[PDB]
Design a protein around this ligand. Structure first.
Ligand code: HEM
Length: 154
């Protein structure tokens, strides 16, 4: 699949707002994921112990990882589809080291959409949400292809 320049513009416009507070968005999204799909938390031996949302919000380590993963996604989105280089190491670690199923990538995609819709309604109308979904679908499609080449079901 291929996004038009207009669709990329909608994605990068709302992303520019996200970048005003990388740590906040990074954390909010992970917490949303963990609350909606508790099984995903079990994949993080580093955060598995956290029992409540309050404990998650107070975790300095969770906030730091929020910055790490969200910045990596931003780097990929800014490539506007030319992300082969960025995808390689990410696919290898998540398939071979962390063992993250494609299903969980769909779960975090839903969490991203939920948080952007809550925090940026003015810049995340139907057309903008559609473009972001398309961008995340492209990412998941390419990641799935890499998983297969690397020997992981997904
Ligand atoms: C938008 C998709 C995602 C991006 C861009 C992303 C990015 C990253 C990055 C950059 C790292 C650190 C370097 C590395 O190990 O590769 C990381 C680590 C990790 N990711 Fe992801 N990730 C994504 C989705 C997920 C999902 C959905 C899960 C699990 C539900 C997951 C679980 C992990 C785990 C367990 C680590 C190790 C954390 C630690 O112990 O330090 N990731 N991810």
């Amino acid at each position: 699949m291929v996004l038009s320049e207009g669709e990329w513009q909608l994605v990068l416009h709302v992303w520019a707002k996200v970048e005003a507070d990388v740590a906040g968005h990074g954390q909010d999204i992970l917490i949303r994921l963990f609350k909606s799909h508790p099984e995903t938390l079990e994949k993080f031996d580093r955060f598995k112990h956290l029992k409540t949302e309050a404990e998650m919000k107070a975790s300095e380590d969770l906030k730091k990882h929020g910055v790490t993963w969200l910045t990596a996604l931003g780097a990929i989105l800014k490539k506007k589809g030319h992300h082969e280089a960025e995808l390689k190491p990410l696919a290898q670690s998540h398939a071979t080291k962390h063992k993250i199923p494609i299903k969980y990538l769909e779960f975090i995609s839903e969490a991203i959409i939920h948080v952007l819709h809550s925090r940026h309604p003015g810049n995340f109308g139907a057309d903008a949400q559609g473009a972001m979904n398309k961008a995340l679908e492209l990412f998941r499609k390419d990641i799935a292809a890499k998983y297969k080449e690397l020997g992981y079901q997904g």
